[PDB]
RNA sequence: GCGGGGAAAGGAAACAUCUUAGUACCCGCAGGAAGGGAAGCCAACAGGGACCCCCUGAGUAGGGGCGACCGAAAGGGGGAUA
RNA sequence: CUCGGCUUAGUUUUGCCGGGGGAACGCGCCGGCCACUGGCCGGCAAGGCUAAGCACGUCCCGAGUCCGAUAGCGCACUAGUA
RNA sequence: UCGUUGCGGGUCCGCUUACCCGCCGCAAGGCGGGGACAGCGGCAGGCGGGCUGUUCGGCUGGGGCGGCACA
RNA sequence: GGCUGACUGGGCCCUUGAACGCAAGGGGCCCAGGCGGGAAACCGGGGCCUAGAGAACGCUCGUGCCCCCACCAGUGGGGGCC
């Protein structure tokens, strides 16, 4: 943690605290307006440095509708090359069980609902989650293990 | 089915035809009576009993007579923005049977209103009756409905030792007839 | 300007050159139902000021010439413009 | 130590299968009845019970059978019934003018709709949270400056 | 604390919808607290289980000259428990 | 249900008030984000009460990186006084 | 226009008891006139500076008139 | 004389906007589809070149064996991307 001195204390004497002689220290007008304003007038050019050329997009307008979120799945993917750093801190501690000699974990008490292909698989594996993309059930099987898709 | 089940028709379809015509001559009084008028018996007696009404000594039934359509929703007179101007249409957030129910209130001071139902309408007035308590009568004291609005109290000495009591006989009940049975 | 009713014209759904017949655009009945109709009806609603903008002053001459060419064979229909000019007498 | 009630937790869609256990509001009576108990006499022993809950939970099951086990033996002391043990109505003053008859329910919207969403619990909500300018209420228009923010700082 | 009546200034760099704000203020009515409270509930085929208040969900969904700006609820964790 | 209006995030979908129309009955009725139909699920409005846990400060007690007689409450005093 | 709005006879006629207007009466009620009209409430169209809120742009050899050297 | 390239789907560059941020509009060079003229080369995404030019919200039309509308399926309706 270092400190440092606030700038009232350099700004005594100096008359004007930063803010220059001739356009001073102002209201509202200096920010030309109140909030987040003028962004279609004189503000425009911040627009066009940041936004859509044209129409402004992401400042003004309507793009597609939201599909609503109380019945839509909030996803929670692991990849596989991350999983199988997981199961190998869950065997240490003791937490995985060979149930049919091979490893098996099920990705809904662990906390995912979803297998992804990113990585790779080093062990021969038994996953159990709802949804698995199509590297991930390749690359699983391609190291002896296979992936069970339950039903939500 | 009740003789009330029977009272109630003549506020259904079925009876409506003789009911509006009995009111059409009994309306004409109630227009020349005082506007908050005591009454000996409910209008609408099987109504009165479901809202809490007894013939008890201390409990009021008045009818209630008013104005209908919107409040007098007033013009302002100074600078308003536009949407702020208008009076037609305005109403206020109060229904009529509320403000029936206050009226009758203040013909009646101490007394508490229990609750109120429609009678009837016309052309300019609407017509409620509004029932209510005296909580200083020893009638309407030790009601178990009227209490809930005059106060009760019952010590902690009383319901606590009750249950204590009540909890240390189960316990020995229990003894006998449940605990082979769990351990079993 | 002069414009033929008929035109030989590339069709995206054949992918073919396709005779196409000619004809004005015109809009559409503005439908009750439409959200900014529901919209709007709801603002109107109350008391106020007119709640939204009405212009007043115009200064365009002419519109965009809009033709629809319609496909003779499948039915696919083209909308295009020609240009801000008066109105064409379709021949 | 009185075992207390567990419960699943609702499994939303938005889950998407992840679920979790909770504490209850009480033992179901079914519960309740695999272990020789009404909800009179579950009170009765200082347990809380919840007649609504229809599921029955073999975990519930075995904590209120070890339990009682100790209790019927001395082992354990049961606390106080679960059932009131105060009376208190005070006389009511006013009621027609505070809006507290059925009259003034129905235009406050309490036969409608719940108590949260009745307009004047909603002025009063947002009247504290601006007075103590607690939460959202510390900053006006937080919302349009995160929005032109993230604009600006994700373009 | 509860019910009702109810603005404008200012902001939107003008201004009327809007906001400010159901605020200021006015009228009525209570208590030592008030109001709320015991599923014609919420959910989604898995289950919660009266209510109020605190933390969160969340400035999310949504409303809005779709502008300024406004803005939940269910769910989760607690206080307390009838 | 419909029309007008205030309000609400409530949006073809919030609550209510007013004008007009206006049910059924447990073999029934209500809800499941536009309406209707079928299925499934959840319930029983239009009557009343309810402790605890939450707001406040005339008042009492304690504390203080607060001020120290132009400061700090307008008032350290025969101050809401002259 | 919806409601108030009822009763007889073939949209029309009549009636009175609603409702309205006046007289008498402390009140009760009586008398006369009008009469399902009018009046009143809701909704809708018109007239509506009577009243409320606002806008009345810029450049400019000062402003104004002009012009558009405003795209 | 024969035609409709005043074409469908896209990309890159120049100018508007000097070196130096920054709309719309206009122009140029191409790739793919399918054409017109021509023996062929080649040319045609309007006019020999430099002018005739319009954001958000809203509406409307075209387009897709197109996407969504709150437990599930269906019908009407609504919304969405280009
Ligand atoms: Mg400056
Ligand atoms: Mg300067
Ligand atoms: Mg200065
Ligand atoms: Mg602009
Ligand atoms: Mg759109
Ligand atoms: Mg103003
Ligand atoms: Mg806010
Ligand atoms: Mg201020
Ligand atoms: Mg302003
Ligand atoms: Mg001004
Ligand atoms: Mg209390
Ligand atoms: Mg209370
Ligand atoms: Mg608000
Ligand atoms: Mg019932
Ligand atoms: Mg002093
Ligand atoms: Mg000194
Ligand atoms: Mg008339
Ligand atoms: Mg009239
Ligand atoms: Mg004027
Ligand atoms: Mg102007
Ligand atoms: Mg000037
Ligand atoms: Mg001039
Ligand atoms: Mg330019
Ligand atoms: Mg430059
Ligand atoms: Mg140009
Ligand atoms: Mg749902
Ligand atoms: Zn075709």
């Not at chain 1, 007038?41 to 911040?46: A, E, G, M, R, V």
């Not at chain 4, 049961?78 to 009621?95: C, D, H, N, S, W």
Request: charged content about 30%; hydrophobic content about 30%.
């Amino acid at each position: 943690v270092r400190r440092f001195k606030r700038a009232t204390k350099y700004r005594r004497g100096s008359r004007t605290h930063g803010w220059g002689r001739v356009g001073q220290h102002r209201k509202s007008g200096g920010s030309g307006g109140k909030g987040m304003v003028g962004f279609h007038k004189h503000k425009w050019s911040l627009v066009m440095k940041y936004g859509e050329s044209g129409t402004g997009w992401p400042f003004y307008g309507k793009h597609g509708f939201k599909q609503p979120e109380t019945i839509s799945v909030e996803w929670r993917p692991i990849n596989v090359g991350r999983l199988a750093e997981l199961v190998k801190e869950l065997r240490e501690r003791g937490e995985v069980r060979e149930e049919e000699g091979r490893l098996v974990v099920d990705l809904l008490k662990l906390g995912y609902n979803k297998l992804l292909g990113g990585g790779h698989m080093d062990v021969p594996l038994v996953v159990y989650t709802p949804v698995a993309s199509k590297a991930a059930v390749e690359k699983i099987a391609k190291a002896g293990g296979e992936v069970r898709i339950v039903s939500l | 089915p009740s003789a009330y089940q029977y009272m109630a028709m003549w506020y259904r379809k079925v009876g409506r035809e003789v009911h509006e015509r009995l009111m059409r001559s009994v309306l004409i009084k109630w227009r020349k009576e005082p506007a908050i008028v005591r009454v000996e018996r409910p209008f609408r007696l099987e109504r009165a009993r479901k809202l809490g009404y007894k013939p008890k000594q201390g409990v009021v039934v008045a009818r209630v007579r008013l104005i209908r359509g919107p409040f007098n929703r007033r013009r302002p007179d100074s600078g308003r923005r536009p949407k702020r101007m208008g009076v037609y249409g305005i109403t206020a957030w109060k229904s009529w049977r509320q403000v029936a129910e206050e009226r009758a209130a203040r013909k009646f001071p101490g007394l508490e209103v229990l609750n109120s139902y429609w009678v009837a309408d016309d052309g300019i007035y609407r017509y409620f009756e509004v029932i209510l308590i005296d909580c200083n009568q020893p009638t309407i004291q030790r009601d178990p409905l009227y209490s809930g609005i005059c106060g009760r109290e019952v010590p902690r000495r009383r319901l606590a030792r009750r249950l204590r009591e009540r909890q240390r006989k189960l316990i020995e009940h229990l003894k006998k007839t449940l605990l082979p049975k769990l351990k079993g | 300007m002069k414009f033929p009713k008929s035109v030989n014209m590339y069709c995206p759904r054949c992918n073919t050159y396709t005779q196409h017949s000619v004809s004005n655009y015109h809009g559409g009945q503005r439908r009750s139902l439409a959200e900014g109709q529901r919209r709007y009806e709801r603002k109107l609603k109350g008391y106020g000021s007119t709640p939204k903008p009405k212009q007043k002053r115009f200064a365009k001459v002419n519109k965009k010439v809009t033709l629809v060419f319609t496909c003779t064979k499948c039915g696919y229909k083209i909308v295009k413009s020609l240009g801000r000019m008066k109105k064409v007498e379709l021949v | 130590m009185i075992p207390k009630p567990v419960v699943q937790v609702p499994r939303s869609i938005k889950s998407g299968g992840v679920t979790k256990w909770k504490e209850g509001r009480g033992f179901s009576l079914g519960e309740l009845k695999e272990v020789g108990l009404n909800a009179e006499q579950a009170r009765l022993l200082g347990l809380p019970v919840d007649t609504r809950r229809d599921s029955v939970w073999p975990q519930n099951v075995e904590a209120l059978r070890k339990w009682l086990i100790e209790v019927l033996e001395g082992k354990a002391t049961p606390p106080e019934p679960t059932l009131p043990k105060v009376v208190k109505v005070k006389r009511k003053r006013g009621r027609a003018f505070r809006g507290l008859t059925s009259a003034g329910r129905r235009s406050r919207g309490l036969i409608s709709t719940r108590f949260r969403e009745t307009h004047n619990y909603k002025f009063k909500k947002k009247a504290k949270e601006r007075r103590l300018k607690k939460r959202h209420e510390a900053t006006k228009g937080l919302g349009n400056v995160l929005r032109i923010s993230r604009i600006i700082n994700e373009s």
